[PDB]
Amino acid sequence: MPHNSIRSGHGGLNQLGGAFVNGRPLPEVVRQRIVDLAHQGVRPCDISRQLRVSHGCVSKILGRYYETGSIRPGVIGGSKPKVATPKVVEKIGDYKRQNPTMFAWEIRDRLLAEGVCDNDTVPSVSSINRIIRTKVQQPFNLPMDSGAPGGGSHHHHHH
Numbered sequence: 001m002p003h004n005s006i007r008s009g010h011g012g013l014n015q016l017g018g019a020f021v022n023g024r025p026l027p028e029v030v031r032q033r034i035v036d037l038a039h040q041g042v043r044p045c046d047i048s049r050q051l052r053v054s055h056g057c058v059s060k061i062l063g064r065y066y067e068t069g070s071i072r073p074g075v076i077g078g079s080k081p082k083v084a085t086p087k088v089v090e091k092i093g094d095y096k097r098q099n100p101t102m103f104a105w106e107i108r109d110r111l112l113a114e115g116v117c118d119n120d121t122v123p124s125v126s127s128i129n130r131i132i133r134t135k136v137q138q139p140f141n142l143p144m145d146s147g148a149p150g151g152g153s154h155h156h157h158h159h
Contacts, residue, residue: 031067038062084121091116092128096135104128 018024037047047058066072088111095107102110105125111117 026068026070030064031071034062034064034067082118082120084117086123088117088121089123089128089131092123093131096132104132 014025015021015023016025020027020029037050042050044055044058044062047053047062048055051057051061053061091111092104092107095102095110099107099110108122108125108128111122112119
């Protein structure tokens with residue numbers, strides 16, 4: 001699905017770096033000329049003299065109106081994200097310390113009831129769990145004797 005046409009292919013082959021020559025993109029020299037002549041205040045009937053140009057030429061030269069589309073430092077923006085501190089995880093830990101009988105998912109509400117954090121920002125039940133274990137867990141192992149096979153049942157008879 002081609003979402004509208006685009007300017008495929010180059011604009012021929014620009015020479016580039018024509019220092020006040022020709023085919024010169026964002027020629028800072030132009031900005032500098034206009035700024036200079038504007039400073040001492042060269043009237044249009046005298047721009048014509050200095051550059052040896054007409055009057056329509058003078059209009060284009062003096063009146064750049066954003067020099068090859070530049071000289072305009074500005075761009076509008078803004079944002080409003082739902083940010084909060086990770087320290088709320090520590091507060092779950094503390095509320096475990098204050099009230100250990102209340103479970104992970106109970107202490108999740110202990111914050112909201114008091115009005116400490118927002119319903120979004122309150123940390124995951126699965127995350128707060130990882131703190132609890134360092135205080136109160138049992139090691140995940142139970143070694144014992146096992147795998148002890150054997151045999152011995154062989155007989156013979158004769159007259």
